[PDB]
Amino acid sequence: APDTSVSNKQNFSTDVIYQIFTDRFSDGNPANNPTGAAFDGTCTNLRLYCGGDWQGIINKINDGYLTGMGVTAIWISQPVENIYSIINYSGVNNTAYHGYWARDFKKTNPAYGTIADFQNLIAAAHAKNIKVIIDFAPNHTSPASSDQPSFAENGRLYDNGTLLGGYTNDTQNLFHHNGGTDFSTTENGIYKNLYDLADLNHNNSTVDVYLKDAIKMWLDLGIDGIRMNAVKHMPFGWQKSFMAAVNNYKPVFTFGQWFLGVNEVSPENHKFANESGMSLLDFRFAQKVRQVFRDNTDNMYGLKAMLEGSAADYAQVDDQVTFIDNHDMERFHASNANRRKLEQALAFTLTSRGVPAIYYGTEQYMSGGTDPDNRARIPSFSTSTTAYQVIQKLAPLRKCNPAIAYGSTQERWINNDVLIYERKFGSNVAVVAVNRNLNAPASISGLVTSLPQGSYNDVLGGLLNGNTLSVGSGGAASNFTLAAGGTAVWQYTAATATPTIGHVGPMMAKPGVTITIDGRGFGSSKGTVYFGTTAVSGADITSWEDTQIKVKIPAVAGGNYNIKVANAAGTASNVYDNFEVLSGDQVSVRFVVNNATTALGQNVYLTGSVSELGNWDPAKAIGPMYNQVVYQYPNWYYDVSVPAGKTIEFKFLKKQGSTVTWEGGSNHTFTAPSSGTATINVNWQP
Ligand SMILES: OC[C@H]1O[C@@H]2O[C@H]3[C@H](O)[C@@H](O)[C@@H](O[C@H]4[C@H](O)[C@@H](O)[C@@H](O[C@H]5[C@H](O)[C@@H](O)[C@@H](O[C@H]6[C@H](O)[C@@H](O)[C@@H](O[C@H]7[C@H](O)[C@@H](O)[C@@H](O[C@H]8[C@H](O)[C@@H](O)[C@@H](O[C@H]9[C@H](O)[C@@H](O)[C@@H](O[C@H]1[C@H](O)[C@H]2O)O[C@@H]9CO)O[C@@H]8CO)O[C@@H]7CO)O[C@@H]6CO)O[C@@H]5CO)O[C@@H]4CO)O[C@@H]3CO
Ligand SMILES: OC[C@H]1O[C@@H]2O[C@H]3[C@H](O)[C@@H](O)[C@@H](O[C@H]4[C@H](O)[C@@H](O)[C@@H](O[C@H]5[C@H](O)[C@@H](O)[C@@H](O[C@H]6[C@H](O)[C@@H](O)[C@@H](O[C@H]7[C@H](O)[C@@H](O)[C@@H](O[C@H]8[C@H](O)[C@@H](O)[C@@H](O[C@H]9[C@H](O)[C@@H](O)[C@@H](O[C@H]1[C@H](O)[C@H]2O)O[C@@H]9CO)O[C@@H]8CO)O[C@@H]7CO)O[C@@H]6CO)O[C@@H]5CO)O[C@@H]4CO)O[C@@H]3CO
Ligand SMILES: OC[C@H]1O[C@@H]2O[C@H]3[C@H](O)[C@@H](O)[C@@H](O[C@H]4[C@H](O)[C@@H](O)[C@@H](O[C@H]5[C@H](O)[C@@H](O)[C@@H](O[C@H]6[C@H](O)[C@@H](O)[C@@H](O[C@H]7[C@H](O)[C@@H](O)[C@@H](O[C@H]8[C@H](O)[C@@H](O)[C@@H](O[C@H]9[C@H](O)[C@@H](O)[C@@H](O[C@H]1[C@H](O)[C@H]2O)O[C@@H]9CO)O[C@@H]8CO)O[C@@H]7CO)O[C@@H]6CO)O[C@@H]5CO)O[C@@H]4CO)O[C@@H]3CO
Ligand SMILES: OC[C@H]1O[C@H](O[C@H]2[C@H](O)[C@@H](O)[C@@H](O)O[C@@H]2CO)[C@H](O)[C@@H](O)[C@@H]1O
Ligand SMILES: [Ca+2]
Numbered sequence: 001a002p003d004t005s006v007s008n009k010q011n012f013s014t015d016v017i018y019q020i021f022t023d024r025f026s027d028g029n030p031a032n033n034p035t036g037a038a039f040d041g042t043c044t045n046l047r048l049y050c051g052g053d054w055q056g057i058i059n060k061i062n063d064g065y066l067t068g069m070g071v072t073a074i075w076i077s078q079p080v081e082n083i084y085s086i087i088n089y090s091g092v093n094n095t096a097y098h099g100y101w102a103r104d105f106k107k108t109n110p111a112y113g114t115i116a117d118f119q120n121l122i123a124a125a126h127a128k129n130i131k132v133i134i135d136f137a138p139n140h141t142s143p144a145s146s147d148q149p150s151f152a153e154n155g156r157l158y159d160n161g162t163l164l165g166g167y168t169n170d171t172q173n174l175f176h177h178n179g180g181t182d183f184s185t186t187e188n189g190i191y192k193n194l195y196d197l198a199d200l201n202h203n204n205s206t207v208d209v210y211l212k213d214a215i216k217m218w219l220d221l222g223i224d225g226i227r228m229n230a231v232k233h234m235p236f237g238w239q240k241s242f243m244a245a246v247n248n249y250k251p252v253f254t255f256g257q258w259f260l261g262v263n264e265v266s267p268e269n270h271k272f273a274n275e276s277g278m279s280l281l282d283f284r285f286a287q288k289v290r291q292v293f294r295d296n297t298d299n300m301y302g303l304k305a306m307l308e309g310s311a312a313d314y315a316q317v318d319d320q321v322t323f324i325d326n327h328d329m330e331r332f333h334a335s336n337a338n339r340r341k342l343e344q345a346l347a348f349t350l351t352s353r354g355v356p357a358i359y360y361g362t363e364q365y366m367s368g369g370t371d372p373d374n375r376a377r378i379p380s381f382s383t384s385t386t387a388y389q390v391i392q393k394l395a396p397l398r399k400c401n402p403a404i405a406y407g408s409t410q411e412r413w414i415n416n417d418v419l420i421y422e423r424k425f426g427s428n429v430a431v432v433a434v435n436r437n438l439n440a441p442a443s444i445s446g447l448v449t450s451l452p453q454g455s456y457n458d459v460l461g462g463l464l465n466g467n468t469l470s471v472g473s474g475g476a477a478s479n480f481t482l483a484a485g486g487t488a489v490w491q492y493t494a495a496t497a498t499p500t501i502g503h504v505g506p507m508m509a510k511p512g513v514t515i516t517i518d519g520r521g522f523g524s525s526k527g528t529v530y531f532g533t534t535a536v537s538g539a540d541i542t543s544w545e546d547t548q549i550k551v552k553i554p555a556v557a558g559g560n561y562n563i564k565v566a567n568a569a570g571t572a573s574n575v576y577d578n579f580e581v582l583s584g585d586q587v588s589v590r591f592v593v594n595n596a597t598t599a600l601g602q603n604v605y606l607t608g609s610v611s612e613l614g615n616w617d618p619a620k621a622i623g624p625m626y627n628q629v630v631y632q633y634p635n636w637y638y639d640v641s642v643p644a645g646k647t648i649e650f651k652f653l654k655k656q657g658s659t660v661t662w663e664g665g666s667n668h669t670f671t672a673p674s675s676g677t678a679t680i681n682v683n684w685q686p
């Protein structure tokens with residue numbers, strides 16, 4: 001199938017995700033509704049179950065609501081069994097309607113449906129060219145009272161019905177007992193409880209092996225993607241090991257939730273997206289959008305800065321899942337705000353780089369404050385809304401115009417309130433004009449584009465007061481007036497002659513695993529694939545078509561390789577960098593070094609004889625390591641993904657900037673577990 005096929009689990013850049021709060025979408029089966037104090041059929045008490053389930057999703061998939069909108073993928077609440085308790089938080093009853101309080105990762109949440117129901121949902125979706133993404137929160141189980149065991153379900157973790165352990169009397173140390181996080185530091189938010197939620201200990205072999213086995217069941221069930229909950233609250237090294245487990249089995253597009261506040265630009269976050277094996281929800285993008293289009297706290301120069309910066313900071317900016325709101329923030333549409341603000345933010349998002357995600361009901365102009373007022377039941381299934389039509393008109397462009405799915409992004413015209421940007425990929429172009437100023441039109445002169453000479457009709461058909469464009473020679477557009485609150489889209493599509501790679505997934509795996517290379521101009525006859533200088537052709541190239549190529553990763557040494565391809569004629573494509581070839585199956589190992597004294601600003605890192613540890617290159621060292629929670633300075637610790645069963649030599653370094661101090665003596669050595677976890681403890685050698 002082609003790159004845009006529903007069968008493409010490794011690429012969502014040509015799709016448009018619709019995030020569904022399962023309980024608040026559609027109750028397709030009243031028979032599975034919880035009862036009594038745990039239920040409110042009228043969905044007035046937004047903290048109880050409202051009855052929304054998987055059958056309801058199936059129904060809306062079958063009645064054209066989602067298809068008619070151009071939605072090609074859905075992101076649903078965590079499907080696993082949650083606790084059944086009703087939690088009283090200061091006179092307020094609560095339930096796990098949101099699916100974030102897991103109790104058994106190998107079972108379904110009855111409220112949502114059964115295993116069969118889930119299977120039916122997968123089949124119904126795939127039958128309508130709709131991919132299924134599931135939320136997965138392996139950070140914790142549920143709320144628990146380390147003091148009072150009778151509280152809730154004591155954060156009890158079950159394994160397909162078999163109790164593994166609870167928060168109280170945690171002799172096995174399935175959980176963390178480091179108190180609660182104040183979000184003061186990254187390490188603080190990782191090894192301490194998220195609120196009162198029982199923090200799972202991924203360095204516990206039973207926990208590590210359990211979770212990995214769990215996701216495998218869901219993969220076997222047919223999921224096309226994973227949305228990892230609170231990734232900034234789990235060990236990065238462990239998550240890499242988790243992603244390797246997924247990629248080395250059945251790779252599916254995975255993105256994590258790493259919240260970013262207004263104006264927050266974090267290198268840690270960039271590094272995670274660039275090296276974890278998963279992408280992220282674009283909070284940087286979402287927060288700037290809200291400033292620019294919703295709150296009026298930044299102008300188009302901020303949007304432009306975000307677009308340029310993000311393209312340079314994220315190795316795979318096209319893998320970042322964009323959005324304008326979600327279940328953890330005020331609904332984008334303010335009760336008395338001008339609807340055009342939402343329509344414009346949506347139009348911008350749908351035509352921008354990455355993977356667009358639309359919070360359910362956005363298209364019905366739902367308003368609401370923070371939890372749980374942002375999770376009201378969808379008020380209508382109308383297709384006549386302006387927002388609904390904007391999506392219906394733009395969403396499909398991600399499939400028919402590779403410029404929008406894989407194209408670069410360039411600012412072509414700009415001022416305080418106006419942004420005109422261009423997307424380009426092969427013989428495809430798209431230009432988007434946006435005037436956020438709802439009371440003042442703008443005069444556009446001097447606009448230059450990559451569009452071929454001619455007249456271009458607004459794809460939105462003037463729905464958002466757009467207009468026709470006139471392109472002359474050199475691609476210079478004739479003067480035009482951009483209406484107040486105007487938004488227009490102009491495009492050009494044609495067959496691409498030369499091989500051009502627009503996407504690669506997954507971006508991290510061990511040799512032998514099959515990767516998907518998408519783009520255009522590959523030709524119909526098998527060509528060549530390059531991993532760095534290594535050439536791959538013939539049998540290992542499972543399939544080759546103009547837009548998609550499936551090839552097995554060659555048995556090259558672990559490392560970072562640049563991906564390139566050549567058509568049958570020998571014509572080379574562009575280079576898609578940052579591909580990580582694993583040294584093999586991975587395991588999460590905790591490295592601990594004692595007595596590593598440093599000065600303020602100086603940190604300790606880990607370097608080793610394998611690519612997973614940077615092959616002795618300080619620039620590629622692992623860290624900086626932690627020294628507050630699990631161990632205290634001068635003791636340092638860190639959880640790293642390493643090649644399972646390999647004898648590895650390592651050493652520690654002290655670094656300030658790029659200046660590096662090597663641990664003295666000889667190399668430390670150890671053999672990585674064949675499965676599960678392990679902890680290596682050593683003293684820093686002078
Ligand atoms: O059971 C807990 C909830 O679980 C479910 O939520 C999940 C999220 O849906 C999921 O997407 C993900 O999101 C979390 C993310 O992983 C974290 O990194 C972090 O993300 C950022 C956060 O979103 C930002 O808003 C911000 O937080 C700051 C906050 O904005 C700021 O105001 C302040 O917060 C303090 C409040 O101001 C103060 O009033 C008090 O809050 C109380 C709260 O009022 C009270 O009602 C009670 O909260 C209950 C809640 O009412 C319940 O509904 C239930 O929520 C569950 C959700 O419904 C699920 O969807 O349980 C809650 C907790 O028991 O208690 C609160 C605190 O005791 O204190 C606030 C904290 O000081 O400061 C914060 C921090 O700066 O920054 C974050 C990044 O640093 O949080 C995301 C949302 O939790 O994971 C969730 C967990 O599965
Ligand atoms: O949340 C706290 C801060 O978080 C963020 O900081 C991160 C850093 O930016 C990042 O680089 C990294 O830091 C690591 C650092 O790089 C490593 O070197 C290592 O540090 C260890 C150090 O090498 C060891 O020598 C030792 O430090 C000793 C230190 O040498 C010695 O002087 C003494 O320290 C005393 C202070 O000198 C003294 O002044 C006082 O400290 C006060 C502090 O002066 C005061 O301002 C106040 O600090 C605030 C701070 O101002 C706030 O901005 C906020 O800081 C956060 C950063 O902004 C974030 O970027 O909160 C702070 C807490 O109040 O209060 C301090 C105490 O009241 O007393 C000190 C003790 O006598 O002793 C120390 C200890 O032996 O140990 C170092 C680590 O223990 O590790 C660093 C972090 O682990 O990571 C940071 C967090 O992720
Ligand atoms: O492929 C090459 C090697 O790559 C890998 O090596 C990595 C290290 O394992 C790893 O630890 C890290 O190294 C850093 C080190 O940990 C830090 O401590 C520091 O090192 C500096 C050191 O602390 C300083 O004192 C100084 O070293 C001086 C040394 O003390 C001094 O005696 C003299 O060295 C001479 C030797 O004494 C002498 O015996 C002879 O060495 C022979 C060697 O005995 C013989 O076996 C053979 O060596 C092979 C080696 O066996 C192979 O395995 C292979 O090594 C690789 C490592 O295995 C990888 O892990 O190649 C070697 C060379 O072919 O042949 C040797 C030469 O005949 O000669 C020595 C020099 O003539 O002088 C030195 C310098 O004054 O400096 C050190 C560095 O400044 O920093 C290290 C990183 O720079 O990373 C390594 C990868 O870079
Ligand atoms: O003509 C090329 C020129 O186009 C854009 O410049 C605009 C500018 O953004 C407007 O604010 C206004 O000054 O009109 C200019 C066109 O004359 C691009 O921004 C700029 O990079 C480019 O050179
Ligand atoms: Ca139901």
Ligand SMILES: [Ca+2]
Pocket residue numbers: 139189190191192199200233234235
């Ligand atoms: Ca945690």
Ligand SMILES: [Ca+2]
Pocket residue numbers: 314315316576577578
């Ligand atoms: Ca790249």
